[PDB]
Amino acid sequence: PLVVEPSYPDLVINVGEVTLGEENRKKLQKIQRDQEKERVMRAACALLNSGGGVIRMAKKVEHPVEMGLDLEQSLRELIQSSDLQAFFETKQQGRCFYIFVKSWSSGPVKPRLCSLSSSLYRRSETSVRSMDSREAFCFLKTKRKDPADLIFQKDYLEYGEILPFPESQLVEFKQFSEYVKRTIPEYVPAFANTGGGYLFIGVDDKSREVLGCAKENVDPDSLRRKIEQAIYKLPCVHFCQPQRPITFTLKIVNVLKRGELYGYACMIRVNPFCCAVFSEAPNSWIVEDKYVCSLTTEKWVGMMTDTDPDLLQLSEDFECQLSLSSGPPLSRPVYSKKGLEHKKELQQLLFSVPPGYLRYTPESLWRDLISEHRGLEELINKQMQPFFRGILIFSRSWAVDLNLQEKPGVICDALLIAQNSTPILYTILREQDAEGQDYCTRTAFTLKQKLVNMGGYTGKVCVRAKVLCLSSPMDYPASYSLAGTQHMEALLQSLVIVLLGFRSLLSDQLGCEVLNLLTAQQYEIFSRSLRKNRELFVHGLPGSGKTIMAMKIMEKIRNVFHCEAHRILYVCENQPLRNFISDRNICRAETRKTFLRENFEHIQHIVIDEAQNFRTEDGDWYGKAKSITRRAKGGPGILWIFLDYFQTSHLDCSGLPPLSDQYPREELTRIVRNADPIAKYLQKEMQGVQGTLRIKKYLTVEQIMTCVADTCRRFFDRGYSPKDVAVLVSTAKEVEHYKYELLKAMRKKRVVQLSDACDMLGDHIVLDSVRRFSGLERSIVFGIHPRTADPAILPNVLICLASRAKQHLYIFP
Ligand SMILES: Nc1ncnc2c1ncn2[C@@H]1O[C@H](COP(=O)(O)OP(=O)(O)OP(=O)(O)O)[C@@H](O)[C@H]1O
Ligand SMILES: [Mg+2]
Ligand SMILES: [Mg+2]
Ligand SMILES: [Zn+2]
């Protein structure tokens, strides 16, 4: 079997012994030549889809060689072209021979996967054949949006009778003999996938005279079960519903010699299939940990057919930084809300290319490292002399920045990008360690994999690991080194998406793991080390991202502190928000009441969100929070606090501690959520995208409900779903009357759906009290009489209403 070796900084496949050189190769018999060609083909196919790699063939001949005539054409067919140099390069090291395989790139249409054979067949006039990836993709995309019968109806035939028509796109005749097996998969998929038709078994293929083997050959009662089992064993795939099995019919007709029963003949009719049917699983491969495993039929067909999803908040305001229609196979699409920074503006702002000097980065972090640590400057300025220009990106650990546990004893990591050299990964160990090399190797491994899986880098990239200290790689070919400004900028841009990318909340509404790009401010906040920032009172406007960074930080804490995901405790005020965050299972979750009630003896890290809506009515939460966090055996765990501090009174004794004691501090100063008019109006009250703001006054409750029903009708007439709307009121006790009123007024338009905020899973309009609802959001929000029934809830409730409406806000004061 193919074996994957872990000790390398990029994916390496060793195929065992191989003999190359056409003069040397052609001597070998096929039962070995083709076997080894197929092993190498498995390797190459696997790596062209799994984000690139290196193939490592061993040999027992030491002189230089050349690609064999068979392999240099199998690679061309597999890549679907003769431009081998673009994807494969040859370099050998004596008895070891390497070919370095880029990662496939669907973008300039070319398909999204590379596979030896698609296993799909179709009838072309008189011929049957397999399909190549381009034709397979065209066919799958297309299916994503009588003389024969008068013979079939005959119940018997005589030996030697000539059938009146030849073979065609509709029919075939097959001579008989073991032959009762394997004969069906050859032709049946060909007919089903297009046109449908018949195949006659027991009839000469050329003379067309019936022969029907003989009595001793066929037992119809067994042949029927055999043929049906063979038919229904062939894998199929559907995009439609319900899943119809293979539609077919059979006749096992007695056939006579001189009028005497002499044998049997079979006529099988195959009807056009509503979807694609595969003779066998496509011969395609993708490599997982330690194993290069085949792709299943459903996985294959799904992968080849994926495309960028569309919806109201996926279009006209979201910009496609990466697409499934131009990136590698395994890349998830990425987006960035219109009006924020792209991937381009972000790397300019974070990793701008110098013209003539090797800029370090991040400047502040370099300052902290050099001041903190003795001789780091001395150790590094030596090993930066050769490289001329580029960037050197530092961090206190590149493992935790890529979702791998930070290692004890690491001083920092650094990525070295420079012109006329490959990117290089530096880790500066505090002291030499036996296991130290493993950390740098695996970190290089994962950074490389992410740079082309998550990064979406169509280009040709390699990463190398170096272990420094304060106290035999693959000689990648010459073309993998950054040859100018353009390619350096491309690689930096596809590092921007490795770092600033996070799993969007639209993954719930779409199912696919759509990634999204942070802002500069949030990245600045997120980059802070944890072991030096045990406490932090983050600020920011409402709807600016506090929840995002909160969620991210329970992953970062889990990585850094080696703690199980259940020891990190979240806290909040509203049950709906805790519901929205409880299911992620990245943490244990609570609300402030039970937070005081419960005895958290197993908690070691706390992240308090929307803190400004807390209250002392049951006791003190801040004191207990410090008591828990600071009692940890392993040292004081995080106690990050989030909150809102627009220019409005917080009040309360524990409406955040005294403002002079809120330090250290950070500021997320942008309202990404809402649209322009909502942002414009929302700013006035606190004193890039279209939307609507509608305030109506002096309307009766009857008129108000008529208007909201009419607007729901209008929006659903434009694609908005039941889950795209919300109608909110002041208090919970006011919910009951208005629920009934709305369900009534909606009768005139015969709308039916209404459910609370707790029932968030169903596609129903959500109605609840704002204080209860706070923490969530919907595309359209209706406000029914927001009023200061209890000014203990921060008096500015018109903000907690207008902050929930992404694109359309309707206010009824
Ligand atoms: N980088 C980003 N680009 C675009 N939109 C983003 C980004 N980060 C977050 N958002 C969106 O902005 C909104 C704010 O979400 P989040 O819950 O984190 O904010 P918040 O200020 O904590 O909210 P709340 O106070 O209402 O609980 C969400 O719709 C979120 O999907
Ligand atoms: Mg024929
Ligand atoms: Mg929030
Ligand atoms: Zn179907």
Residue numbers in the entry: 7 to 114, 121 to 157, 188 to 219, 225 to 518, 531 to 746, 772 to 897
Task: Reproduce, without paraphrasing, sentences from the article in which this PDB structure was first reported.
Human Schlafen 11 (SLFN11) is sensitizing cells to DNA damaging agents by irreversibly blocking stalled replication forks, making it a potential predictive biomarker in chemotherapy. Furthermore, SLFN11 acts as a pattern recognition receptor for single-stranded DNA (ssDNA) and functions as an antiviral restriction factor, targeting translation in a codon-usage-dependent manner through its endoribonuclease activity. As a subgroup III Slfn family member, human SLFN11 has a tripartite domain architecture consisting of an N-terminal nuclease domain, followed by a linker domain and a C-terminal helicase domain. The N-terminal domains harbor its tRNA endoribonuclease active sites and the C-terminal helicase domains of the dimer are able to interact with ssDNA.
To understand the changes in the functional behavior of SLFN11S753D and to provide a structural basis for the regulatory role of the S753 phosphorylation, we employed cryo-EM to determine the structure of the phosphomimetic SLFN11 Ser 753 to Asp mutant bound to ATP. SLFN11S753D yielded exclusively monomeric 2D classes, which is in contrast to the predominantly dimeric state that was previously observed for SLFN11wt 26. To counteract preferred particle orientation, cryo-EM data of SLFN11S753D were recorded at a tilt angle of 25°. The SLFN11S753D cryo-EM sample was prepared in the presence of ATP, which is in line with the observation of additional density in the nucleotide-binding pocket, suggesting a nucleotide bound state. ATP is coordinated by the Walker A and B motifs that are responsible for ATP binding and hydrolysis. The same region adopts a vastly different conformation in SLFN11S753D, disrupting the long ID-helix, and forming a more open conformation. The conformational change of the ID-region between SLFN11wt and SLFN11S753D is accompanied by a rotation of the entire helicase domain by approximately 140°. The loss of dimer interface I, as a result of the rotated helicase domains, likely destabilizes the dimeric state, explaining why SLFN11S753D adopts a solely monomeric state in solution. In this conformation, SLFN11S753D is unable to bind ssDNA, but is proficient in ATP binding, though not in hydrolysis and has diminished tRNA cleavage activity.
